[PDB]
Amino acid sequence: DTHKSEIAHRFNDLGEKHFKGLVLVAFSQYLQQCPFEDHVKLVNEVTEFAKKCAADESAENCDKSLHTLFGDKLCTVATLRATYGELADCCEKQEPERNECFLTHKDDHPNLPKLKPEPDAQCAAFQEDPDKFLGKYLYEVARRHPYFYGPELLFHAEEYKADFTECCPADDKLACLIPKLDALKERILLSSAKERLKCSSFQNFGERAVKAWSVARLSQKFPKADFAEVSKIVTDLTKVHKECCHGDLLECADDRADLAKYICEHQDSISGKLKACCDKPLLQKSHCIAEVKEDDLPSDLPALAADFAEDKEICKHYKDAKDVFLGTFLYEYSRRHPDYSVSLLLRIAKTYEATLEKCCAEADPPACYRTVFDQFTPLVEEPKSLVKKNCDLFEEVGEYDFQNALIVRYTKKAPQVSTPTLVEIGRTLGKVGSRCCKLPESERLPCSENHLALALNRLCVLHEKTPVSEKITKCCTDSLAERRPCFSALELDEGYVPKEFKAETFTFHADICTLPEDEKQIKKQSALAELVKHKPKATKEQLKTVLGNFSAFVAKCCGAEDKEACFAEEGPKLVASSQLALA
Length: 583
Ligand SMILES: [Cu+2]
Ligand SMILES: [Cu+2]
Ligand SMILES: [Cu+2]
Ligand SMILES: [Cu+2]
Ligand SMILES: [Cu+2]
Ligand SMILES: [Cu+2]
Ligand code: NA
Ligand code: NA
Hints:
Blueprint: H1 6-14, H2 16-30, H3 36-55, H4 66-74, H5 80-83, H6 87-90, H7 97-104, H8 119-128, H9 130-144, H10 150-167, H11 177-205, H12 207-221, H13 227-246, H14 249-265, H15 267-270, H16 274-278, H17 282-290, H18 305-310, H19 314-320, H20 322-335, H21 342-359, H22 365-369, H23 377-413, H24 419-436, H25 444-465, H26 470-477, H27 483-489, H28 517-534, H29 540-558, H30 563-581
Helix pairs in contact: 1-2, 1-3, 2-3, 2-9, 2-10, 8-9, 9-10, 10-11, 10-17, 11-12, 11-13, 11-25, 12-13, 12-20, 12-21, 13-14, 14-17, 19-20, 20-21, 23-24, 23-25, 23-28, 24-25, 24-28, 26-27, 28-29, 29-30
Bound molecules: copper (II) ion (CU) (6 copies) and sodium ion (2 copies).
C-alpha cells in the first residue's frame, strides 16, 4: 500500500489543491493552445482517478507510472490532430518515448495576446469564482512559459490572489492593481528566464554543466557550509530541476519540498540568512531559499595556494579524482568570490582544469602549475571592464538610449535575426543596466553577467526554434561558460547582404500617437533595427542621430492638429534623407 500507486502517494503528500494546481500547469505547458475548460476537465478526471486509487491502490491501472497516466490523459483530448498536428504522432508512442516527443513539441514563442489587466471585469470574475480565476492565471502563465517552475508558479498565483484580495474592495482598483500586476509580471519574466536557463543547460550541455553551475552559485550563497553539504544540496536541487524540466511536476514539487525541509533543518550549519525563509509557509519557504541573500564570508576561509597550486602531488589527486578535485576547487574559489559572476567562476574552473591537463603531461608539472591562479587575472578583468563601460553608458543616456545602443550592437552581430527578436533581446539587455548599475559596485559584475546570461539564453532558445545565423549557433552551443564572451566578441557579420530598402518599413502614421509609451518605443526600436539591417556599416552615432530625427518627427505630428496630414507630408522626406545620413 506504499509501493503500489505513485499517483495516490503524490496526491496524499502534496494534497488536492497543489495536486490540481500542478497538473493544470503541466497540462497547460504541454498543450498551450487548448482552451481552459478542456484542461480543467482533464485535471478533474486525473484527480478523480487519484482519489479512487488512494482508496484501493491495488485497483486496475493504479500501478501505472505518472508519465503513462498524464500522457494517456493528454492523448484523450478533443481535436488533437487539428489543433496539434504533431503531438498526436507522439500519442502513437509508449513512454518514455512519448514524453520526449511531447517535450520536443513545446513552443517557447507561442505568440499569444499580452496579458492586459482589466480591473473591473477581473475583480468581477475574481468575486464570482476565485478558484476559476486563479486557475485561469495558472493556465495563462503556464502556456506562455512552457518550462516555468511549477511550484514557483503556484507561489506567484498566491501573490496574484493577494493582489486582487487587497485591491478589489475599493477605490480606483486600477491604481491599486496596475503597479502590483506590473511588478508581478516583471517577477514572472525573471523567474521564467532563470528556470528556462536551467532547462536549457540540461538540454544543450547535460547534468554536469547544471551541477557545476549550482556548485558555484550555492557556494557563493552559503560560504559557511562545507563541501559535503553543498554537494548534497546540489545533487538534490539538480534532480529537482531535472524532473521539472523533464515534465514530472509532481516529483518536481515533492523533491523541492524535501530539499527545503533539509536546508531548514541544517540552516545553522548552512547559512544565517535562512532564518526568515525557514519561518515561512511551504511555497514561500522554497521561494525565499531560492532567492536568499548571500551569507557573510567566514573568518576562517582557507588559503588555497597550498593545496591547489603549491602541493607537489596535485597531478596524482587530479588523475585519481578529476571530478571531485575540480568540484572542491570550484566550491572553494566560488565561496570566497561573491563578487564574481557564476559564468566567470565556471571559466576560471575550466582554465584551472586546462592548466592541470597541460602541466601533468610535461616533465616537471610543479613548476608549470605554480602560477595557475595568475592565469585567472585576464579572465577577471575582461567582464569588469565591460560592466564598467556599459554602466557608464547607462548612467549617461538612460534605459531607452542604452537599449538602442544594444539593439544596434546585436543587429550588427546577427542581422539575419527577426526584428521582433532583436528588439526583445535589446530591451531585455538594456533592463539589465537599470537592474544592476545602481547596485553597490561589488554586486554589479555578478548581477550584470548573470542577467546577461538569462537574456542570451532567451536569444539562443528562439534561435533553436528559428535558426538564421551560424555565428549565433556556435556561440549558443560551443560552451555555456563562454557564451557571453563569445557573444561580446562577435563583430558585424560582413557576409550579410544589406536588406533591400522598403519605405513603408520606416513610414509612420497617426495610430502610434494613441499607444502607451513603451509600445511607441518598441515601434521606434523596430525601425532602428531595420535601419541597421539596411545599412549594416552605419556607425551607432549615425543611427542614433537618424532615430532622434524620427522621434522628433513623431512627437511633432502627434501634437499636430491634423496628425495624419502631418505624417503624410513630413514622413517621406525624413525617410529619403535618412538613407543619405546612414551611408
Ligand atoms: Cu506497497
Ligand atoms: Cu511520502
Ligand atoms: Cu520522468
Ligand atoms: Cu519566487
Ligand atoms: Cu597533496
Ligand atoms: Cu501615412
Ligand atoms: Na555537460
Ligand atoms: Na521586419
